[model samples]
Target chain A: AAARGSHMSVNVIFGSDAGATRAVASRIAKRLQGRAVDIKSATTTDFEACSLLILGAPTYGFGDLQTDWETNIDKLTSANLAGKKVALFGTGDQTNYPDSFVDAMGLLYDHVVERGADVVGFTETAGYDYTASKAERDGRFVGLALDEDGQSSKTEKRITEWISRLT
Target chain B: AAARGSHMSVNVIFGSDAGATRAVASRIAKRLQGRAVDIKSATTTDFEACSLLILGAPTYDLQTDWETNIDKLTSANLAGKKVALFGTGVDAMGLLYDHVVERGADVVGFTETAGDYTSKARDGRFVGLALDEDGQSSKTEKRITEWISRLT
Candidate 1:
């Protein structure tokens, strides 16, 4: 209800083609009581006004990075991402791609950080099962959800925990 | 049948309490004829002589830089992985672990592209799959089986 106090200024954006990712990020915003912006129509100036940038994309290859999500990325010039905080997570079946989501988030995270964006948090649940992470690439930067029902909650917890440390 | 023409020495060191990871890494080394060393007590001389180091360890809470393997990392600081990688406790865990560990491996490129080391074992017959207590999934077993089928 209120943009100030008890709540922080946050902005959530999705790729032009992001249908599932939007559901996840928006659901997360809803639970966290933060603001969510669906940037399907051109990268709007309003999208750039948020203090936090959350991006999600589908995985490709065996952990290789892809450019399919460039729709939302093109809007944030190097200057825009600079000094801003960015985090990423995605969906991919390791059983299918083997590399889990390839480097989809990796590429985005690198560019955002290189642009001088202070990372508020990373999506530690990129891939997970049960309750804990078990591999070198256990998706710490992002996180995995137990299942759809609990994934949104876990993501918000991770994001909230990480941001709490920074602010 | 013997060490390849390449003079570069490849060492596969693994630390697994499960005993499953050891068998898997050994299978890989067996197929590839790679020299296997127990990282628990690898001497500086034994390590320094090598050019490439392949490591394997189980994942712990999304932290693939398992502390047990942490000692061996000294080798990285000293020799510099130059081209290093690892197999984690869980299969996909290695993917995230790779995100961080790959940085330590000094990888120029992955084995697929830049001649990176994908498995510790070069012999296909020897490479094994990452299995849980009962065994690896039917799919993993098949893939590894196929990979070994191609080797001696």
Candidate 2:
């Protein structure tokens, strides 16, 4: 059995129906490229080799993962994610579904934590517009949040900064 | 009793999450104001009074309220009803457009694609009004106004 730990390597898994979340996933993977990270679509094989797992998704129909995630989330929950380091990120219309903005990521956050994975990357939500969201844990987003709709101009900088904080 | 004719009125119904689709709905309503058109967040009212029905919703993760509330129309008699769809989202508005057509609704009216929107375009034209309110809020008003004229 291959021993896995954050000091070993990381895997980026993403599920996107539209290109918004897919673009975000690519940015994160690029930022962490060559740092023992491998990017994959959510449909990839088992995660037994993942030391640090980063999951990304787009929200839909009230706190629901997009079509791809809806069909593939079982992979995460059914895998051997015990004691793994996990992080999450997602896209949503913060201004429209403010109450549920990025809730899909929150769904992933809960799943990983429940499976005994150590969750990291809780981000500040000062610059976003939203009355409430499951993505928030104690006044902070569970992970990196991007609003390409209301704040398209800030995506690159936000992703860059969040990736820098990964170490 | 109102006279039953295709010229009776237009009703714009919609469900919005981030307010983009709501803004789209409102823009359509304002354009038709004083011309016998009404707008409401998604409702179950009878469609007989409306000679024309305009449905709108923002794409949530590439899906919309059409699936969430398909029954709203399925429960009604749409035999010969005229419908037009408009939406705000990343992509996949075409599927919703097709769903309306498949449900026996007379699909009428299409909007031209504008700016950097590259989703669901039919021969370089969108099936309905396609907007990137997130990236291009500035163009929404003008696009809405122009599309409204085409519908009227």
Pick by lDDT: which candidate is best?
A: 2
In the range A71-96, model 1's lDDT, one tens digit per residue, is 45555542355666565555444434
| Reference-based lDDT, residue B118, model 2 | 24
| Chain B TM-score for candidate 2 | 0.75
- Pick out the ten consecutive residues of candidate 2 chain B with the lowest summed lDDT: B1-10
In Å, candidate 2's interface RMSD is 30.5
DockQ of each: 0.01, 0.01
- The superposed Cα distance between candidate 2 and the true structure at residue A128, in angstroms, equals 1.1
lDDT of 1 by residue, B79-99 (tens): 244444444342433442343
On the 0 to 100 scale, the lDDT of residue B71 in model 1 is 42
lDDT against the true structure, per candidate, is 0.46, 0.66
Error of 1 at A163 (Å): 7.8
